[PDB]
Amino acid sequence: SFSGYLKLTDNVYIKNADIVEEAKKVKPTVVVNAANVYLKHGGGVAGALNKATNNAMQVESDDYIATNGPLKVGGSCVLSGHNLAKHCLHVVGPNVNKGEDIQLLKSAYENFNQHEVLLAPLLSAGIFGADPIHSLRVCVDTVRTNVYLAVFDKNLYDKLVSSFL
Numbered sequence: 197s198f199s200g201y202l203k204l205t206d207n208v209y210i211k212n213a214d215i216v217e218e219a220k221k222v223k224p225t226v227v228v229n230a231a232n233v234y235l236k237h238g239g240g241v242a243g244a245l246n247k248a249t250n251n252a253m254q255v256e257s258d259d260y261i262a263t264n265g266p267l268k269v270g271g272s273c274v275l276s277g278h279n280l281a282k283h284c285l286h287v288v289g290p291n292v293n294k295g296e297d298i299q300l301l302k303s304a305y306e307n308f309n310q311h312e313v314l315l316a317p318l319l320s321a322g323i324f325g326a327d328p329i330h331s332l333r334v335c336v337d338t339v340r341t342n343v344y345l346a347v348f349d350k351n352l353y354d355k356l357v358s359s360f361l
């Protein structure tokens with residue numbers, strides 16, 4: 197199970213780790229993907245998770261979109277976790293580089309509450325353009341289930357821990 201995490205609150209844990217490597221090690225019930233509404237897993241966490249599945253995540257996602265259409269910003273869907281996890285919860289945080297409403301970040305984190313425990317990245321961080329310090333604050337103030345946050349960037353991990361209120 198999860199090891200080497202720093203406890204931030206009753207239910208939020210954080211580690212400087214590559215979420216793909218964490219998923220391969222732990223094989224959690226749920227790994228969260230930082231998805232976009234089209235489930236096009238090109239870059240960031242999504243590109244890395246998809247590449248670790250040998251593109252099986254993308255093939256499955258294209259079938260999901262063909263059947264259901266795009267997700268909403270703030271929404272999610274549960275798909276297979278492939279070799280990484282039992283399930284992948286694809287969650288769409290607002291992409292600030294697309295001018296999406298940052299208030300939808302709370303709605304995005306609410307999807308985590310449908311799962312008792314999750315391995316996840318900070319939503320809307322990285323290439324999604326939001327402030328990761330703000331994303332962590334929204335996470336802690338929204339998610340009530342057990343969330344194990346993997347932050348890839350060491351300098352960002354250090355800044356997140358040292359600034360955590």
